[PDB]
Design a protein around this ligand. Structure first.
Ligand code: TYE
Ligand code: NA
Length: 657
């Protein structure tokens, strides 16, 4: 029997307690041959009747209605505890057992796939993890909290990973529990954020009610709240018998944004199992004392009218459920290979490094135009660090991932990579030591992708979301900033770092590294404020590395200075130049004062505030000194970095919007 297109729709729809866009569901049924349903799970190893029987009923309906059904096995998290214990292979077996309960429960596997997160993710780490960070980048942290006093660790990440899966697999339908609602809804919202008309339909299935009064769904910490598949028939009888069983008809449970089942005095888990585990089966009906009830409704009518006695209804269900489970018990009884997985599942129920030589770590500012004051700061800390530790090493990280996460500059990968390579090239030319190694985050991730993201979560699971919000000042811009912070600590540990250097632009972020390693990693702070903005105290009035010679002149012209001033910006810059060089000479025509070299900043002030060091002569000498000092750098603007600069002005254009 081939179902007509209306009957296919009806059958697939029946799966869902809600359907987000039935129109979308239809058009899928009407146009698309191998509609993708996906659903996912972390192998627990103790399978309840909803995972065994009910899922199978719904998988079968989807394959019937002409879907391919992909199971996403979230086994990736097993890698956390893998170096010790090797829990990946153990969780694969728990999974393999689950699939095998599924075969024997009657899942038609013809059109059903199983994918392993561990296998799949690590085969396209690039495409996956970049999307994870983008989903965070484009979303307000408040909105990622809704997918989960204030206890929240970095479980802000789990939703992003989940939301990624949806796109990674190319799911057309999300056929998961109603409680996964908000993550799935996030995916629909995300399509909009990437100009993508076709959206995933959310076909949320019912959450089975807990057996005892006041338990909206099954309880992990109460075995009698649900029927489990390894429950021998005496257990089934005992669990049902005591079950809550109101004499009330069972209307739909109006949906909360949360997806979260709510226990009520009206809901009857005996009647829920009868709807979900019995009648949901294509041809099945329940029989009590010689009468057979064709629909769930008929049985309900019976119970409430008082034709079927509570004891009898529960007797019916027990016979019914042992009937569904018996095939599955024999199979594990007789199929050795099956049995072994079980006894394996049973047995499982048995319950950093400091670098010898010092090494500093600095993060290049993800900025389009880098101030000279920040640049010089970086060069100084480097030179200071090396002098203090000549044996040691310094490393500059270009954050070509984390900076995309935080929505830095345009928040586009190509723009940000360009901004970094240019400004870093300029920084080396401006005087950053050769001895300093330059590495990109991409280089560090590829280097050890598996371990990197594992570390990221490991760290994540030991710290509160609120704390990462503190690190950023208490508010975060987007959920991507949260990922950036974690990544930093991760990079630090992989780079085997003893010191983290921090510019003015890093704020407190980098302390995380220190706190995490329990103060083993020391913090070093940049020394800035030696080159101020050029305008009068109280724009393009800041000197940046990428200033060409035409730019400098303009800025040093506009720069504020008046006569008889002991302090202003042009003096500050002058005072700065004088310290590094060791001196500062200025050419003057005799009768304007004559040529005169200052080897001490006091003297400079002395002459400026009271005396005939005219500002014009000071600026002339300062402007020329910046030019001499910036030569190599500006040669790269017009030369080797010419092409890469193009992207940057294109970026700037965008952002002016
Ligand atoms: N989040 C669910 C319970 O932990 C399992 C899951 C479902 C779908 C996925 O793509 C990933 C995990
Ligand atoms: Na298959």
């Amino acid at each position: 029997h081939h179902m007509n297109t209306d009957e296919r729709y009806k059958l697939l729809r029946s799966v869902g307690e809600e359907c987000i866009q039935e129109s979308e569901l239809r058009n899928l049924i009407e146009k698309k041959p191998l509609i993708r349903c996906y659903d996912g799970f972390e192998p627990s190893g103790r399978m309840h009747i909803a995972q065994g029987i009910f899922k199978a009923v719904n998988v079968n309906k989807c394959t019937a209605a002409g879907c391919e059904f992909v199971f996403w096995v979230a086994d990736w998290f097993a890698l956390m505890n893998d170096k010790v214990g090797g829990e990946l292979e153990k969780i694969r077996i728990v999974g393999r057992y689950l699939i095998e309960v599924w075969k024997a429960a009657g899942m038609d596997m013809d059109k059903v796939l199983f994918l392993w997160s561990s296998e799949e993710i690590t085969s396209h780490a690039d495409t996956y993890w970049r999307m994870v960070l983008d989903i965070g980048r484009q979303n307000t942290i408040a909105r990622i909290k809704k997918c989960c006093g204030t206890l929240t660790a970095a479980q802000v990440l789990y939703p992003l990973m989940q939301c990624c899966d949806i796109f990674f697999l190319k799911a057309d339908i999300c056929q998961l529990g109603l409680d996964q609602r908000k993550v799935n809804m996030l995916a629909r919202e995300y399509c909009d954020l990437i100009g993508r008309k076709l959206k995933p339909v959310i076909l949320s299935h019912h959450m089975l009610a807990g057996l005892k009064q006041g338990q909206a769904k099954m309880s992990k910490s109460d075995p009698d709240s649900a029927i489990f598949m390894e429950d021998t028939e005496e257990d089934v009888a005992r669990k049902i018998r005591q079950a809550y069983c109101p004499r009330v008809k069972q209307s739909a449970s109006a949906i909360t944004d949360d997806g979260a089942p709510v226990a009520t005095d009206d809901r009857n888990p005996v009647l829920d199992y009868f709807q979900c585990v019995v009648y949901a089966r294509p041809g099945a009906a329940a029989t009590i004392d010689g009468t057979t009830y064709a629909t769930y409704e008929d049985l309900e009518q019976a119970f409430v009218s008082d034709e079927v006695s509570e004891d009898a209804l529960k007797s019916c269900l027990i016979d019914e459920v042992n009937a569904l489970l018996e095939p599955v018990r024999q199979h594990f009884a007789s199929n050795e290979e099956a049995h072994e997985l079980l006894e394996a599942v049973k047995s499982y129920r048995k319950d950093p490094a400091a670098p010898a030589k010092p090494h500093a770590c600095m993060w290049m500012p993800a900025l389009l135009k880098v101030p000279l004051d920040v640049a010089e700061g970086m060069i100084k800390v480097t030179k200071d660090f090396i002098a203090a530790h000549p044996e040691g090493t310094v490393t500059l990280v270009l954050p070509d991932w984390s900076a995309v996460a935080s929505d830095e500059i345009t928040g586009v990968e190509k723009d940000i990579s360009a901004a970094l390579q240019v400004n870093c090239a300029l920084l080396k030319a401006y005087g950053l030591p050769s001895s300093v190694k330059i590495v990109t985050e991409n280089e560090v991730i590829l280097g050890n992708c598996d371990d990197f993201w594992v570390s990221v979560i490991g760290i994540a699971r030991k710290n509160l979301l609120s704390h990462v919000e503190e690190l950023y000042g208490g508010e975060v811009r987007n959920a991507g900033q949260v990922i950036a912070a974690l990544m930093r600590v991760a990079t630090a540990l992989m780079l085997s770092v003893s010191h983290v250097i921090s510019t003015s632009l890093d704020g407190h972020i980098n302390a995380f590294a220190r706190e995490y390693t329990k103060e083993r990693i020391d913090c070093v702070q940049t020394l800035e404020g030696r080159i101020p903005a050029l305008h009068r105290p109280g724009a393009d009035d800041v000197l940046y590395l990428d200033d060409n010679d035409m730019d400098i002149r303009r800025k040093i012209k506009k720069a504020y200075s008046a006569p008889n001033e002991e302090a202003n910006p042009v003096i500050s810059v002058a005072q700065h130049l004088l310290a590094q060089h060791g001196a500062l000479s200025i050419e003057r025509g005799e009768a304007n004062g004559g040529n005169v070299s200052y080897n001490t900043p006091e003297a400079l002030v002395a002459d400026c505030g009271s005396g005939a060091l005219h500002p014009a002569d000071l600026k002339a000498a300062v402007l020329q000194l910046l030019l001499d000092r910036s030569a190599q750098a500006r040669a790269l603007l017009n030369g080797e970095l010419k092409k890469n600069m193009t992207v940057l002005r294109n970026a700037e254009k965008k952002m002016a919007k």
